[PDB]
């Protein structure tokens, strides 16, 4: 195949989505500090 691992110095990634319960209980003020 081709290049395994991280693809293209500090790195970040997309996060997984929350489940129905975690999402219903979430407050976007957590995002917007």
């Amino acid at each position: 195949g081709i290049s395994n691992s991280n693809l293209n110095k500090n790195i970040q990634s997309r996060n997984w989505y929350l489940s129905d319960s975690q999402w219903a209980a979430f407050k976007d003020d957590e995002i917007t500090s």
């Binding site: 195949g1 929350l18 219903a24 976007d28 003020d29």
Partner: protein, 427 residues
């Protein structure tokens, strides 16, 4: 063509109509005035970059800006007066009155023919809701062919908690593990997976039922989101049944109390909607919006390009938000993939899934949904399970029974039941 900066004066009340094709890259830096891309204001002295999408830059006040684009010249720029923004503002301020006065925010559904009710209307109202009394409306997308905050084939509910990305056709992005200029979104996503509503209507309606349930739970626990209402985008009237039975389902499941109709006063849709939904909503709550200026019609090649752009964005981020997806090698034995019932494969589409045989014809370049359900979970559990995210199967090796899978999150392969989508991506 040119790679230098050129001055442009957009007079008050006009759209600078932009149609970037393929490899078109445009940089805009505003010197003075107020300009907006579907309600999102462009900050002065800040460079904005746009690639391969069509949109209008509206001049709220006479604006002076500099632009850099090799695919554009001063003599071929299209700047034309907009005479329909009045219709949007009148509507927004009516909704803003309901959010301040009433017990809960309005739950608005947008119905119509062309996808000019999408983006144009939806996006502006959302941008505008946040603009004056800092509301957090829930933007709901029910058109799975339209990628907004996620990949195609999804119906979603996303709180507009902060400004949208004026640079992106996708409105913006979901949360990331690090630091960004803009605050990102936290969407609730339901996987339809198939390319068209017609492919499995019962499944499309199950998706709506499932999203409706979680939306209710969120609204019950979130005061700010409840005080702001919902803005609901639907698929084209043509894509739905003659009776419009799907809109009844949407209205019930999403507790819609206001309807916005986008058509001409000659269109029979207006009276049809008035007759069909009036007994449920009340006629005082059904509104007519005429053909809005600025937004030009879009082809399938543009749609396919937009679907590709959003898939790359999901794993790799945007131009100013570089993200690192993670590639892993897995054995055929390590994956449990299901496929939805559809009109093509099964004559009549039902709310059911079928096991997938690991074959390069079936899985190479395929977008797969990752659920919260265990590998050994039964069909009925999998179909009701929330979505964790998406993966891309890059390569399928038959000899050494292995697959190259791309994940958005570095780490382990989730040991969860998976669902194959109709969506494909190469590179």
């Amino acid at each position: 063509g040119d790679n230098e900066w050129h001055k442009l004066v957009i007079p008050k009340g006009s759209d600078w109509q932009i149609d970037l094709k393929a490899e078109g890259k445009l940089i805009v830096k505003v010197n003075s005035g107020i300009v907006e891309i579907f309600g999102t204001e462009l900050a002065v002295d800040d460079e904005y970059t746009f690639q391969n999408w069509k949109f209008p830059i509206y001049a709220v006040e006479e604006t002076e800006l500099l632009w850099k684009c090799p695919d554009l010249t001063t003599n071929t720029i299209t700047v034309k007066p907009n005479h329909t923004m009045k219709y949007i503002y009148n509507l927004h301020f009516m909704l803003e009155k309901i959010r301040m006065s009433n017990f809960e925010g309005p739950r608005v559904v947008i119905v119509g023919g062309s996808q000019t009710r999408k983006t144009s209307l939806s996006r502006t109202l959302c941008s505008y809701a946040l603009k004056f009394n800092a509301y957090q409306p829930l933007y709901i997308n029910l058109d799975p062919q339209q990628p907004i905050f996620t990949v195609p084939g999804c119906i979603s509910a996303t709180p507009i908690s902060d400004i949208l990305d004026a640079q992106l056709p996708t409105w913006g992005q979901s949360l990331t593990s690090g630091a960004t200029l803009l605050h990102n979104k936290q969407p609730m996503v339901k996987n339809f997976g198939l390319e068209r509503i017609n492919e499995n209507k019962d499944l499309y309606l199950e998706c709506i039922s499932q999203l409706g349930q979680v939306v209710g739970q969120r609204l019950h626990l979130d005061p700010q989101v409840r005080r702001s209402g919902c803005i609901v985008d639907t698929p084209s009237i043509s894509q739905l049944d003659e009776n419009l039975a799907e809109l009844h389902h949407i209205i019930e499941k999403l507790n819609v109390n206001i309807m916005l109709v986008l058509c001409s006063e000659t269109d029979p849709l207006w009276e049809k909607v008035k007759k069909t939904f009036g007994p449920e909503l009340g006629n005082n709550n059904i509104f007519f919006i005429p053909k809005l200026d600025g937004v030009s019609a879009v082809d399938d090649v543009y749609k396919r390009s937009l679907q590709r752009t959003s898939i790359r964005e999901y794993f790799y981020g945007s131009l100013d938000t570089a993200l690192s997806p993670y590639a892993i090698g897995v054995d055929y034995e390590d994956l449990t993939i299901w496929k939805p019932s559809n009109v093509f494969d099964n004559e009549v589409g039902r709310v059911e899934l079928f096991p997938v045989t690991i074959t390069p014809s079936n899985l190479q370049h395929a977008i797969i949904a990752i659920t919260f359900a265990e590998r050994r979970a039964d069909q009925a559990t999998v179909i009701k399970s929330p979505i964790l995210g998406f993966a891309l199967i890059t390569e399928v090796n038959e000899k050494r029974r292995k697959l190259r899978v791309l994940l958005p999150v570095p780490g382990r392969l989730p040991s969860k039941a998976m669902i194959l989508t109709s969506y494909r991506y190469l590179e």
